[PDB]
Structures are given as structure tokens and as C-alpha cells.
Design a binder for this molecule. Structure first.
Ligand code: HEM
Ligand code: HEM
Ligand SMILES: C[C@H](O)[C@H](O)[C@H]1CNc2nc(N)[nH]c(=O)c2N1
Ligand SMILES: C[C@H](O)[C@H](O)[C@H]1CNc2nc(N)[nH]c(=O)c2N1
Ligand SMILES: NC(=[NH2+])NCCC[C@H](N)C(=O)O
Ligand SMILES: NC(=[NH2+])NCCC[C@H](N)C(=O)O
Lengths: 360, 360
């Protein structure tokens, strides 16, 4: 049945793919070659073109992404040729460098070899290429990274135990029972120390965050083909860091410390200090990144841009899908157009899906 | 089939009602009397007790209400005896007085006669007993009240055309083709002029809001019986006014004027002035109402209290239902526990439902 499903997805994708590319005549011929290939080998190989667009389509269909407007500008890096851990490491190191782009982040994606007989050719363990390690006795670092950190320590890695230890790249090549790790070169990673434009004391918090959010634990499904290893990246949206990463109680939880440095009390809820702390924290984030020349975007510009997206999909005769619960910024939800409209949360392929974590 | 549905709902309700009241033995007897009554007349009459609890249960099952913790403290006022427009008017005037309670608002509900043969005995037009009128040329008042305002003007009512004109009570008695209106006595309505604790200039905005949000356009369904007229009220939650009523672009839209008086620019989104304006506006709301002795609650205390609710339903063996999209405050969603947990948005009776508006 796996040989049946693949064919079906393949039919829909190729057709839809070529129609968008304006190559409807080449659909019959290609589908025939694909049919033979699924018999001959048991699967098929996308063309640099198909795969590139397949990855862009997958972005456009990512219900939870608010930055979908730049879907067609995605820079696809095809690394389906990698055979060794050295090839993967270099590939990954390159993704970070090319994406980072000295601050002018480039929404990129490295396409690693897909699953063969349901077996993985490359298996990336990291949630994000760049991510901070988390530990416990009392909370040190990113709690969200507890599980993986221990998995890395079980393989010989050891962190200096600071709140911002950079986890190493960790993956497993087909044929190997365990994965291998590689420490990240400090010169490749851009970090941004957080400061405030009007409050000079904000630096006493000694906060900071990496510049590029490269999600590496998701499977890109493009027409029956499963690319479990396909790291992608956009640029950050202020709130992701100021509201979730740093303010969540289960994350860095700096709201109280922040409220303290802004000279406000934490006595009563009715003073809405948490809210005030959140705003000030997010002004700091947007200002820091910008001062350093690293790309970031605020939730309003992001909502504004997403609205343009909604209009362009319409103008192209494409139904729009989205997850309301994930699309509204965790800060001032009702101040954006997204809060006042409903969305169709339906799955459409190609897309990006979660997958069972190797550790844990 | 209407005589069949009624019986079925009735069975489930009585059982579930008496089990909660600890009167399981009286279920058989009551159900028999109810059966005869549905044959004899075509429907049945709840006891003061049944109806009271039925209305409290309906609150507990209101997926969108964050203040469900005080569900069992609801003050039910049974006015199923009203026969005239004078009886309704007085009933309504009383609900406002008893609910208002000089600022110490009382979560109340007036139970008006239910629908007979699907026909309404009393039909309230107002969205809320107390609500501001809205007009157009340029926006004057509450835009959300445009439709109803015109409906009132078509019946002889005329507003002074200020941003806060109090709409009259408007309803229709069975037998009458058109509804009748009654102006609200200024002494009955409590209003709260908005001011800021640290910013003395906030009063130049000349903002204000009524004290009690009495929702009057919803049908209370309790065991097959439809009470289309059953005005209910709780107390406000700061955000309802500061974030939605006053800040929504489609409502009063005062964010820019607010940002102006707090001495901040509206030049760039990256300064997050909207967010800052929202917070300051909500601090003003909570502070105003409190300074005047009128009950209100902030979104944190509200989330905190709702969490206690979640635990008590559990401790009582009752499945919890809720609408995530409506439960999270439009201000700092991710700072409350509600943002980090999912809810089962399933309909459970008794409950409150929307109904087609008479005007429009
Ligand atoms: C160009 C910049 C982009 C911006 C402003 C942006 C922003 C966002 C934000 C705000 C989220 C929510 C993340 C969270 O709450 O954890 C999100 C999720 C997501 N984005 Fe984007 N994104 C961008 C680029 C990308 C790229 C390049 C891809 C794919 C090629 C993409 C794929 C996705 C997917 C599938 C999710 C869901 C992630 C998850 O559920 O964990 N985004 N996006
Ligand atoms: C004791 C104070 C209460 C608080 C803090 C409270 C708060 C809330 C809030 C914040 C909303 C959202 C309203 C909106 O966004 O438009 C809501 C909705 C609702 N509440 Fe409550 N409430 C209270 C009392 C009540 C009472 C007394 C009842 C019924 C007896 C109730 C029934 C409902 C219903 C059905 C809705 C949905 C309204 C709609 O969808 O338009 N609430 N509640
Ligand atoms: C599942 C999780 O606890 C929560 O419900 C959601 C909702 N909204 C979100 N929205 C975004 N953008 N990102 C998130 O992590 C979440 N988490
Ligand atoms: C239907 C409406 O436009 C919007 O989607 C919702 C969502 N969340 C809400 N939440 C609350 N509490 N109240 C509301 O009016 C709404 N409106
Ligand atoms: N802008 C993006 N592409 N975001 C992807 C998710 C990043 C994730 N929220 C983080 O905080 O690291
Ligand atoms: N606390 C309540 N019971 N709210 C009911 C809804 C009130 C409505 N949101 C208003 O702004 O008038």
C-alpha cells in the first residue's frame, strides 16, 4: 500500500506543481517516468525544480506560520548528495552561514536525502540548529532543552553550565546505532545581547538570544516523499523571544526580574506589571536585534504582511488555511486583523509535520 | 418530533439535576408528572429549584466564560409571572438595580417566560440591558450598536448623538407586531469615567463605560425548555473594556489618542506603542472602576480563578469544556495558564445560545 499512496500523492503534486510553474504539458510524460521509477526502484527522485517549489509550497501551506508572504523567496539548498557525517556537518555549518548572512537573514532550507524504505538516511536530533542547553537542580538555561541536553551528555558532550550553553549539532547516519555530535564554532553563531533604548539598567539582566531560528526536527513531505531531514529558517518575530522564550514561566521566566529593573512593583495584578514587563521586554528585543543589524520583525508588521498574503492567495485562486490559535501574537492579540477573523485549519500537502523524537 | 426531543432533554436534565442536588429518589416521580404534562399541555413547568440550578449549570457549561468559578453563587430571579410590558420593564429595571448593588455587582439572572409552541412570550431586542448607541456620517458612539440604534429610531426613539447615548430598553410582548421601548432612568445606571493613577492628562480623553455588562440576547435552554428571555450578568474583566470595547478599530478605537496622551510616538510599529497604549489603557480601567467601588477583575486574577475552577470540576468528576479562542485575554495571552493548555469545545446542555436578531 506504500507503493500505492506514493503514486497518488505524486499524481496530485506533479500536476499542481507544474500548473503553478506553467508546465502543464510536461505532466503526462513526467508521471509516466515516475510510474516506471516506483516499480523499478520502489520510489522516485524529484528534480531540482520540483523539490525547490515543493519546499516553497510546503511553506505556503504551513498553517502556523505568520510569515508566509515570502514563501516564494525561500532559498532552497539541495544537499541530497551528502554521504558522510562530514558532508552533513559541513552542510549544516553552511546553512547557518548562508542563512545568517551577516544579519540580513535569508529564509533558507537544506534538503537532505529522504527516507528510503521508510528508513532514514540522515536523522537530525536538534530541535533547532542553534538552541541553548537546559539543565536541573535549580533551573539553569532553557528548560525546553532538558531532554536533549541529557541525550547529548549521554554521548560525551559536556556543557559549561551557563544559562546560554550552545548545544552541539547532533545527528545519526543510516547504518550507525548511535548519533554523533559536533560543537558549533562560536564565529558562526550570531547572538544579540538584549538592551533597552531608554532604560540603561536593562543590561543588568544580562539577557541574550541567538539570531537565527533554524527548525531542524520536522519532516517535509512533498508528493509521497518524506524528507525527515530538511532544516528550514526564517527570521524571528520579536514576541517569539520576548514573550515566549524569555517570559514563559516554563522557559527563562524573566518577567519579575524585568519588572524589577523597570522600576515597577510586582505587588498587585491590577497594576498589570506583567503586561508592562512584557511590552518593555519586547521593545528591548526589537531594538537590540535592529541595533545590531540582525533581521527581526514585530508582530504588527508581521500581521500586516500576513494580511497581504491572505489577499495574494485569494488573487491566485488558492484557498487559505491557517491555525488561529498559533497565528495570533501572544502579545496584544486583538490589535491585529488576525484576531478578528477565522481560519480554516486543514492539512494540505506539501507541508511540514512533526515527527517522533529519537531521544526521550 | 418536538414533543419527543423535549422529553429526551427533560430526562437527561432532571436526572443530572437531582443527582447534583442529592435527590435521586425523586427522579422517577417527577419524570412521570412531566410525561403527563407534555401530553396534557404539550410542555412542562420547572420548579423554582430546578430552574435555579438549571441556570447555574448553564453557566458552568459556558465554554467562553472565564469567570465560571462563581457559577453556584448565581442569583436567580424568577419572573415567569410577568404578563405586561409594565411587568417586564419593572423586572428589567430591577435586574439592573439588584445586579448593580451600589458597585458590589451581583452575578444575576432574570428568568422570563419561555417559548410555548416555539412562539416567544417576551422578546428582548437589546444586546445588553445597558449599552451605548452607535451612529454614522463619521463614527459617533459604539459602531457595534449601529443596527439596533436605527431600529430604535424607526420606533420613535432619538439620541442626543453623543459618543455615550444610553439606548432604551426595547422588547416585544407576544401578540404585538412591533416592540415597545423605554428610556433608562439615569439614576439606575452606573458609569465610570476613566482616569489614570500616574498620568493626570488621561482625563482629556473623556472616556467612560457603564458598570454592568448584562447580556440580554441569548436563549437559556434547560432540558428542552427554551428561555429566549433570560438576561444574565457577571462583573467586567478589565480587558473587555480596555482592549476590546475602547481599543478595537471597529469599536471606539482610542489607541492612538491614548498613545498621544501618554507622551509616546505612533511613528513606528517597532516601538510597540499600540501595546504600550493597551497596557496603560487597561491599568486605567482597572483603577477607575476600583476607585469608584464598582466590581471588576483583571485578566490574571480571572485566569487564576478559572484555574481553580478547572480543578473543582475535576474534583467533582465533571468533564471540563471550554473555547480556547475565547478564553485567553486579548492582552498578554501567553502570561496565563489558559494559553498553555488545550480545551474541549463541546456543547453541553443546559447552556446559553445565540439566537437570530429581530432587527437587521
Ligand atoms: C521569513 C520569516 C518567517 C517568519 C516571520 C516566520 C514566523 C513564524 C512564527 C512567528 C511561527 C510561530 C513559531 C512558534 O510560535 O514557535 C512560525 C511557525 C512555523 N513556520 Fe514560520 N516564519 C518565517 C519563515 C519560515 C520558513 C522559512 C518556513 C519553511 C520553509 C516556515 C515554516 C514554519 C512552520 C511549519 C511552522 C510551524 C512550526 C512549529 O509548529 O513548530 N517559517 N513561523
Ligand atoms: C461573575 C463574573 C463573570 C466574569 C468575570 C465573566 C466573564 C466573561 C468574559 C470575560 C467573557 C467574554 C465576553 C466577551 O469576550 O464578549 C464571558 C462570556 C460569557 N459569559 Fe461570562 N462572566 C461572568 C459572569 C457570567 C454570568 C453571570 C453568566 C451566566 C449566568 C456568564 C455567561 C457567559 C456566556 C454564555 C458567555 C459567552 C458570551 C458571548 O459569547 O457573547 N458569565 N464571560
Ligand atoms: C500547544 C501549546 O501549549 C499552546 O496551546 C499553543 C498555542 N498557541 C501558540 N502559538 C504559537 N505561535 N506558538 C506556540 O507555541 C503556541 N502554543
Ligand atoms: C469571532 C470573532 O471575530 C473572534 O474570532 C473572537 C475570538 N476571540 C474572542 N474572545 C473573546 N473573549 N471575545 C471575543 O469577542 C472574541 N472574538
Ligand atoms: N521565525 C521562525 N521561523 N520561527 C520558527 C520557530 C522559532 C522558535 N519559536 C524559537 O523561538 O526558536
Ligand atoms: N463579564 C461579563 N459577564 N461579560 C459579558 C460580556 C460583556 C461584553 N464583553 C461587554 O463588553 O459589554
Amino acid at each position: 500500500s506504500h507503493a500505492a499512496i506514493l503514486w497518488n500523492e505524486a499524481k496530485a503534486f506533479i500536476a499542481e506543481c507544474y500548473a503553478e510553474l506553467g508546465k502543464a504539458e510536461e505532466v503526462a510524460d513526467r508521471l509516466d517516468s515516475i510510474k516506471s521509477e516506483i516499480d523499478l526502484t520502489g520510489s522516485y527522485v524529484h528534480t531540482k525544480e520540483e523539490l525547490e517549489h515543493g519546499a516553497k509550497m510546503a511553506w505556503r501551506n504551513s498553517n502556523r506560520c505568520i510569515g508566509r508572504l515570502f514563501w516564494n523567496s525561500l532559498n532552497v539548498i539541495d544537499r541530497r548528495d551528502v554521504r558522510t557525517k562530514e558532508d552533513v556537518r559541513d552542510a549544516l555549518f553552511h546553512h547557518i552561514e548562508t542563512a545568517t548572512n551577516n544579519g540580513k537573514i535569508r529564509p533558507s532550507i537544506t534538503i537532505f536525502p529522504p527516507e528510503e524504505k521508510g528508513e532514514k538516511q540522515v536523522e537530525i536530533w536538534n530541535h533547532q540548529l542553534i538552541r541553548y542547553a537546559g539543565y536541573e537542580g535549580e533551573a539553569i538555561g532553557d528548560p525546553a532543552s532538558c531532554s536533549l541536553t541529557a541525550a547529548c551528555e549521554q554521548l560525551g558532550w559536556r556543557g559549561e553550565r551557563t544559562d546560554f550553553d550552545l548545544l552541539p549539532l547532533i545527528f545519526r547516519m543510516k547504518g550507525d546505532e548511535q548519533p554523533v555530535w559536533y560543537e558549533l564554532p562560536r564565529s558562526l553563531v550570531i547572538e544579540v545581547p538584549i538592551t533597552h533604548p531608554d532604560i540603561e539598567a536593562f543590561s543588568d539582566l544580562e539577557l541574550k538570544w541567538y539570531g537565527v531560528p533554524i527548525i531542524s526536527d520536522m519532516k517535509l513531505e512533498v508528493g509521497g516523499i518524506h524528507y525527515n531531514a530538511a532544516p528550514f529558517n526564517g527570521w524571528y518575530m520579536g514576541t517569539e523571544i520576548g514573550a515566549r522564550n524569555l517570559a514563559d514561566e516554563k522557559r527563562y521566566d524573566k518577567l519579575k526580574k524585568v519588572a524589577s529593573v523597570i522600576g515597577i512593583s510586582t505587588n498587585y495584578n491590577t497594576d498589570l506589571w506583567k503586561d508592562q514587563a512584557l511590552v518593555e521586554l519586547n521593545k528591548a528585543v526589537l531594538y537590540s536585534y535592529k541595533k545590531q543589524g540582525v533581521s527581526i520583525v514585530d508582530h504588527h508588521t508581521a500581521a500586516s504582511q500576513f494580511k497581504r498574503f491572505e489577499e495574494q492567495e485569494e488573487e491566485a485562486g488558492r484557498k487559505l488555511t491557517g491555525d488561529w490559535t498559533w497565528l495570533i501574537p501572544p502579545i496584544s492579540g486583538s490589535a491585529t486583523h488576525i484576531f478578528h477573523r477565522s481560519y480554516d485549519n486543514s492539512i494540505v500537502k506539501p507541508n511540514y509535520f512533526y515527527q517522533d523524537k529519537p531521544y526521550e
